[PDB]
Amino acid sequence: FVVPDITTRKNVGLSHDANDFTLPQPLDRYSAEDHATWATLYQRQCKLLPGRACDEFMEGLERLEVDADRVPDFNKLNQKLMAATGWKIVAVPGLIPDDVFFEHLANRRFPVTWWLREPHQLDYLQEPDVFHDLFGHVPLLINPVFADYLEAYGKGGVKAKALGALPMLARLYWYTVEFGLINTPAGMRIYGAGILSSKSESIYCLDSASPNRVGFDLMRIMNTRYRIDTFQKTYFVIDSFKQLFDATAPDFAPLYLQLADAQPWGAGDVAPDDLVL
């Protein structure tokens, strides 16, 4: 049997822009159970993350006044985010067209899936939800270097799309925004949103001998496959957000064409030039 998925169920009776896929955050659809699920997730992650998340992430939660006890009101958070870095968040139904996603980032708008997983799905949801998108991704938007990296990434979508290279950018996003690590004198820390919202990938990614921790290298990353339904086999480690921003400022066009004819690395491979940490 085919049954409707969670995105379809949650969005019953609601609409989205056929173009930019933005809707007003539907506050009246959050049930008491939803605010409780949020509070449970928020509490779980805030217990787990000290000494694991990078300091900028934890300070962003506080500076943005991300609610501990209910799903946040996006308008309220936006007042703080706008004053910090001129960003805002926009509600979307769930996954959106790539060109829309890029155009949002290019214009300093971060798309956030509005709805929340059900309490039976507390431990893990495959689809992004509001907890993953808001709690995992938004705190670092108050950091001006990281926010400029996202805007720059957004602006690159047009060139990538024109050259059939969106998957090569998607790999860079996955291995930075979603699953990145950042080294510090106090030890390795986490900045990827997919780790920061996870029940236990923050533990594996720092504590396990199993994954590879490889120094960031733009061409390697854009030539590396990833999988979405398993802990990462490789994490890429930056030294600073200023590195994402700088390492990723050259013209990507000749890089895409060189990659377009290469065979990519598997998700668990170690490449001959990898600085392995």
175 sits near ligand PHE (criterion: CB under 6 A)? no
Select from 1, 12, 187, 251 the one that contacts ligand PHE (CB under 6 A): 251
Structure tokens at 190: 């986490």
Give 63 or 161: the residue with its C-beta nearer to ligand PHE.
Answer: 161
Residues between 164 and 183 that touch Co ion (CB under 5 A): 178
Residues in contact with 27: Cβ distance below 8 Å, sequence separation at least 6, in sequence order: 73
Q: b/e map of 7-43 (b: 16 or more CB within 10 Å)?
A: eeebbeeeebeeebbbeebeeebbeeebeebbeebbe
219 sits near ligand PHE (criterion: CB under 6 A)? no
Residues between 94 and 113 that touch ligand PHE (CB under 6 A): none
Please, what is the end-to-end C-alpha distance for the chain in angstroms?
Answer: 47
Give 128 or 211: the residue with its C-beta nearer to Co ion.
Answer: 128
Candidates 119, 110, 96; CA nearest to 35 is 119
Pure H helices in 112-227? 130, 144-155, 157-163, 166-173, 193-196, 201-207, 218-222
249 sits near ligand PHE (criterion: CB under 6 A)? yes
Binding mask 133-172 for ligand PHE (x = CB under 6 A): -------------------xx--x--x---------x--x
Q: Is 132 annotated as a binding residue?
A: yes
User: From the annotation, which residues make up the binding site for Fe cation?
Assistant: 132, 137, 178
Q: Under the rule (CB under 6 A), what is the footprint of ligand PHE?
A: 152-153, 156, 159, 169, 172, 248-252
